[PDB]
Amino acid sequence: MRSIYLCRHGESELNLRGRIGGDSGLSARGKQYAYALANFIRSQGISSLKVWTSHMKRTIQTAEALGVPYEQWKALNEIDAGVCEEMTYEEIQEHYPEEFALRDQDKYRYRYPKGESYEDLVQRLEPVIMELERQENVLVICHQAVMRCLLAYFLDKSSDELPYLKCPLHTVLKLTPVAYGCRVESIYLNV
């Protein structure tokens, strides 16, 4: 039996402002989740856990509170919002009214202007899944769209439903693959 702790980075300065994308750092409370996740990891008493992050500051900074070392993966970088990077839902609807509607039609195949889609991201995550599905104890601190693609894989979900998976902030999903697919144990850390 092995576990795969899929969690998202601690709340970022941009998450607080309701904005998407960017390479922002952790907010004061984001930092708190880092330490909160720290104590949690210690409470779990795992045998040689491998911590994987992305190149974004938010994930790195979350990891830096665990003391132990981490391996950075560019494939684990958040979906590129393209021309809509660092924008709010409103700004997107205002400056990109067409793209917004077009996106509500098909969420899986929607690709932002100058960016990628869940589909593109799926391709990008192929190597990550391959290495992840043959490792022992792993804590993958990533992002919302990435976490959904990975989660969906281990829970065999449709490309349709994939973009709607519950991947809130400060919540760690303890995945334990078993004979029929996988077992999820949701852990929420209040900070």
181 assigned ligand-binding residue: no
Interface residue with ligand FDQ, options 36, 121, 125, 145 (CB under 6 A): 145
Q: What is the spatial distance between Cα 126 and Cα 59, in angstroms, rounded to a whole number?
A: 20
Whether residue 182 contacts residue 161, with contact meaning beta carbons closer than 8 Å, is answered with: no
- Per partner kind, with CB cut-offs from 5 to 8 A, the member of its own copies, ligand FDQ, none near residue 16 is its own copies
**Residue 78 annotated in active site:** yes
What is the C-alpha end-to-end distance of the chain, expressed in Å? 30
Name the 3-class secondary structure at 53. Answer: strand
Interface residue with its own copies, options 2, 17, 55, 109 (CB under 8 A): 17
DSSP-assigned letters across all residues of 61-74: HHHTTS-S-EEE-G
Return all residues near 61 (Cβ < 8 A) that are at least 6 apart.
9, 10, 25, 26, 30, 31, 34
Q: Looking only at residues 57 through 116 of this chain, which bind its own copies when binding is defined by CB under 8 A?
A: 90, 97, 101, 104-105
Interface residue with ligand FDQ, options 3, 7, 15, 65 (CB under 6 A): 15
Q: Looking only at residues 159 through 188 of this chain, which bind its own copies when binding is defined by CB under 8 A?
A: 161
- Between 78 and 99, CB nearer to ligand FDQ: 78
Number of CB atoms found within 10 A of residue 135's CB: 12
118 assigned ligand-binding residue: yes
Compute the radius of gyration of the chain from its Cα atoms.
Answer: 16
What tokens does 153 get? 């894989």
Rounded to the nearest whole angstrom, what is the least distance from the CB of residue 29 to ligand FDQ in the complex?
Answer: 14
Kindly list the catalytic residues: 9, 78
- Residues near ligand FDQ, by CB under 6 A: 8, 15, 20-21, 78, 143-145, 163
Which residues make up each annotated binding site for beta-D-fructose 2,6-bisphosphate? 8, 15, 21, 58, 89, 103, 107, 118, 144, 148
